């Protein structure tokens, strides 16, 4: 007679810059007590819509996704945030589970794969002569998507919890930089995308995204960024950001998704990782944890309430 | 995915757990500790580092006690998360802060009528006398801080200290973080309620929270509250100050101040937290913890 009722939301087996379909989630959640509606078009595509079963107090935990690895270190992991919220029966919650940023290696392109296995030194040769990489661009990991849980109020999205994604590692990342994690709780702070340079910044909560390599913001559908033009033209080395706003890689790493997306570097410096995104807890809820790093590649959401 | 979660082992109040309490609490877990049985290390959990690695050490201090109105939420303890390089077989010393005691409810029928609002003896004293001297009590105790430290050449060296919350006054602030050990980790001011204990001080007053190096016992309540009607509201283990009508201060690296007089509207202040320059601060200190404290240690993840 355990009174705990628990729902675990996953990516439904989806990966990469785009979220799951209704069919994928039905298969993933078959025979469980979890049923979602997955939008098919517009900015709600791949977002899982869940009907609150009873007026009660719920705990809502989110884990963002990890960033991708570079062509040469530990990936930057997503973070988790948990909050307590009072919901009313028949309320609709909107859940976006972040997906991992793409890794640079391995590759089905034989030339790129020789870079990956350490037999092709063309990038190291270019680096010996330049501050950035300009010709042989690529090899930075994509940013991870953030995980978002939100509701509608009078037709307006209201964020409840956002757990940021990790930034992608640069091609030639060799040390960790130990930048502190940020957690926001003031809805008057602008929830915008991070800086894009050669790699894409992470997507925020509500922005206008125009660049192909930038991660899109949540209210635009949170698609992961493409890679920089030169990586594509030279050898097709594309390292996309993850669904949930991850920025695409160049030789530098893409930014992670969040309430505010992580910044990417201004130039294509092969030692510059993307920054992790910024997490968020609504003042409507009670914060129960700081934003803590979590091991797994893709994100997840855990919801619970007690009979 | 492995981690080590230290709790109060089921202990509450001004005194830390026994070895038997931690053995019971940690049974069937991956955690084994030695708990001091006497001296300034009593109630402090000693843990051997299993492997040379970089670790994250997350400390959470305990919340303060409530006062005479349960609508007034308690002041939550502070979280402090750091990254540290540890060597196999190093010994860490872990004091998990305990919640400050609540004034209410009470087993005493007279005190319980005050708690429910059916006895106005304190309110009448406040009107007639403009201050509480006779019917003292009703303020919550301060919460204990959580302390993680090591010994170096026989001297304690602080790594992470996560402050406790001040107690609410009978008739009822940003997180502060220090990282320079030349700013001395002293107790907070005691008035009628006790100040929180700090890292290293000499505690004289019965109602003051003790400093960490004195054993971190929670303060007694103010003597008049004990004498008049036995309204004892003690600080939590980890340096919480005892309550009077005002609230006790929370433990910390520097203890939280209590008010100068027995003002029934004055909460105790939270303690000051600390992180050593031996570590890296992972995220800003943030008040989060509504009950007892805790410590979570795990292998570092980038």
From Swiss-Prot, chain B:
Cysteines joined through disulfide linkages: 9-22, 104-115, 222-244
Glycan attachment residues as annotated in the record: 30, 129, 179-180, 202, 302
Effect of residue 175 to A: Slightly decreased autophosphorylation. Decreased autophosphorylation and subsequent activation
Entry PTM: Phosphorylated at tyrosine residues by autocatalysis, which activates kinase activity. In cells not stimulated by a ligand, receptor protein tyrosine phosphatase beta and zeta complex (PTPRB/PTPRZ1) dephosphorylates ALK at the sites in ALK that are undergoing autophosphorylation through autoactivation.
Compartment list: Cell membrane
Domain of life from the UniProt record: Eukaryota
Tissue specificity note: Expressed in brain and CNS. Also expressed in the small intestine and testis, but not in normal lymphoid cells.
UniProt similarity note: Belongs to the protein kinase superfamily. Tyr protein kinase family. Insulin receptor subfamily.
Function: Neuronal receptor tyrosine kinase that is essentially and transiently expressed in specific regions of the central and peripheral nervous systems and plays an important role in the genesis and differentiation of the nervous system. Also acts as a key thinness protein involved in the resistance to weight gain: in hypothalamic neurons, controls energy expenditure acting as a negative regulator of white adipose tissue lipolysis and sympathetic tone to fine-tune energy homeostasis.
Subunit composition and interactions: Homodimer; homodimerizes following heparin- and ligand-binding. Interacts with CBL, IRS1, PIK3R1 and PLCG1. Interacts with FRS2 and SHC1. Interacts with PTN and MDK.
Domain comment, as recorded: The EGF-like region drives the cytokine specificity for ALKAL2.
Record's disease association: A chromosomal aberration involving ALK is found in a form of non-Hodgkin lymphoma. Translocation t(2;5)(p23;q35) with NPM1. The resulting chimeric NPM1-ALK protein homodimerize and the kinase becomes constitutively activated. The constitutively active fusion proteins are responsible for 5-10% of non-Hodgkin lymphomas. A chromosomal aberration involving ALK is associated with inflammatory myofibroblastic tumors (IMTs). Translocation t(2;11)(p23;p15) with CARS; translocation t(2;4)(p23;q21) with SEC31A.
Protein name in UniProt: ALK tyrosine kinase receptor
Annotated organism of origin: Homo sapiens (Human)
Part of the intact protein present: 680 to 986 of 1620
């Amino acid at each position: 007679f355990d009174p705990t009722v628990h729902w675990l939301f996953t990516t439904c087996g989806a990966s990469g810059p785009h979220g799951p379909t209704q069919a994928q989630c039905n298969n993933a959640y078959q025979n469980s007590n979890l049923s979602v509606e997955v939008g098919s078009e517009g900015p709600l595509k791949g977002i899982q819509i869940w009907k609150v079963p009873a007026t009660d107090t719920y705990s809502i935990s989110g884990y963002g996704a990890a960033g991708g690895k570079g062509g040469k270190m530990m990936r930057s992991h997503g973070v988790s945030v948990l909050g307590i919220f009072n919901l009313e029966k028949d309320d609709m919650l909107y859940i976006l589970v972040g997906q991992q940023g793409e890794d640079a290696c391995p590759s089905t392109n034989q030339l790129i794969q020789k870079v990956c296995i350490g037999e092709n030194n063309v990038i190291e040769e270019e680096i010996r002569v330049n501050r950035s990489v300009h010709e042989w661009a690529g090899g930075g990991g994509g940013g991870g998507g953030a995980t978002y849980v939100f509701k509608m109020k009078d037709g307006v999205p209201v964020p409840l919890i956002i757990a940021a994604g990790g930034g992608g590692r640069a091609y030639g990342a060799k040390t960790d930089t130990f930048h502190p994690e940020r957690l926001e709780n003031n809805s008057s702070v602008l929830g915008l995308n991070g800086n894009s340079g050669a790699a894409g910044g992470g997507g925020g909560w509500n922005d206008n995204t125009s660049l192909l390599w930038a991660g899109k913001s949540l209210q635009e559908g949170a698609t992961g960024g493409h890679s920089c033009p030169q990586a594509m033209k030279k050898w097709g080395w594309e390292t996309r950001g993850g669904f949930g706003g991850g920025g695409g890689g160049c030789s530098s790493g893409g930014g992670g998704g969040g309430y505010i997306g992580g910044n990417a570097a201004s130039n294509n410096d092969p030692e510059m990782d993307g920054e992790d995104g910024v997490s968020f807890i609504s003042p409507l809820g009670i914060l129960y944890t700081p934003a803590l790093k979590v091991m797994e590649g893709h994100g997840e959401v855990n919801i619970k309430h007690y009979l």
